[PDB]
Amino acid sequence: ANFTPSRLGLVNNTGTGVKDLFLKTFAGEVLSAFRKATIFEDLHTVRTISSGKS
Amino acid sequence: ANFTPSRLGLVNNTGTGVKDLFLKTFAGEVLSAFRKATIFEDLHTVRTISSGKS
Known about the structure:
This is part of a larger assembly, with two copies of chain A (54 residues). Chain A has 54 residues and is mostly loops. Helices cover 0% and strands 0% of the residues of chain A. Chain A contains no helices and no strands. The interface between A and B is small, with 7 and 7 residues.
């Protein structure tokens, strides 16, 4: 060693908590959720009408 | 017979122990130990940050 650096991390250079002046950081990646599977979109018949109620 | 060797190792030519005045050699290889398998180094993501506590 043979050195006494300030460590640049303690207010008043006393006690624990050497990273209170350092803040937590954003890692950079959002997690979100997984997508489910949809199989019934096919396997049946789809039609389209221009007007009416049924 | 017709031969009385001194055996080059006996002390005072009394009793047994013809190998009392001999020393061992160094073969020239250190054995050491094996290395375990480390599989969990990968299989997870490693990030790095410059400052902060978390």
